[PDB]
């Protein structure tokens, strides 16, 4: 259960405030690459960055309204299902104002050709770039981005009722943000659908990403953290 939850009594404005307060820091790469990259040094940077991002993603998840009302069991399942989708929406968000490039970190901005270094990486970079460009075109606002990141967390393991009540509250919040920005009812419903449809592309990139991370594992190119090995195991 999650009956009586504070998360359902929140206003849209209070839900946005809670979500903004929860935000993880923007991480730097603890290493600059020597140019050029190998398969091993690229995957090393991304895997290292991802491992550091996961630690903060865990603290974020706990400050997401409704999340901590779940059993520790269900909390584990949702993060296990969502974590790469969450890293990915973050990447495409930070990359919006960097046309043709992926801002992995302020000191790790790559274009698609540096993607070629690793085998099968270029196709996913292109999908990430396209998603980033779609956000840029739609002028995705910070308040909308934190709502979507929360939907991904709550949504990506629900079939993979309280979770439904919290997702409904997050939908009310997005429409609030859109009403407030001066969008007609018609424009609101159309923007909501457009943002949510992008989540199915983010799910897609996450599933391909995971196939790739499991290829890379088998290859033994780069060591993965225990935490990262558990997350992979969760998706077989």
């Amino acid at each position: 259960a999650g009956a009586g939850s504070l998360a359902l009594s929140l206003t849209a404005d209070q839900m946005v405030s809670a979500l903004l307060d929860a935000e993880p820091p923007i991480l730097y790469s603890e290493y600059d690459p020597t140019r050029p990259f190998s398969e091993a040094s690229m995957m090393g940077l991304l895997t290292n960055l991802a491992d550091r991002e996961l630690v903060h993603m865990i603290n974020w998840a706990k400050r997401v309204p409704g999340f901590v009302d779940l059993t520790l069991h269900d909390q584990v399942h949702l993060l296990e299902c969502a974590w790469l989708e969450i890293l990915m929406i973050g990447l495409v968000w930070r990359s919006m104002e960097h046309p043709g490039k992926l801002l992995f970190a302020p000191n790790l901005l790559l274009d698609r050709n540096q993607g070629k270094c690793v085998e099968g990486m270029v196709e996913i970079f292109d999908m990430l770039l396209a998603t980033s460009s779609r956000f840029r075109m739609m002028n995705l606002q910070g308040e909308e981005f934190v709502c979507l990141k929360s939907i991904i967390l709550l949504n990506s393991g629900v079939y993979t009722d309280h979770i439904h009540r919290v997702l409904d509250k997050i939908t009310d919040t997005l429409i609030h943000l859109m009403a407030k920005a001066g969008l007609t009812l018609q424009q609101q419903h159309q923007r909501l659908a457009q943002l949510l449809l992008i989540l199915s592309h983010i799910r897609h990139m996450s599933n391909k990403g995971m196939e790739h991370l499991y290829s890379m594992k088998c290859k033994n190119v780069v060591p993965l953290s225990d935490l990262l090995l558990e997350m992979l195991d969760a998706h077989r």
Binding site: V55, A61, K62, V76, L79, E80
Partner: peptide, 8 residues
């Protein structure tokens, strides 16, 4: 199970 320990 690391995530269980970090989430608690």
């Amino acid at each position: 199970a690391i995530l269980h320990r970090l989430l608690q």
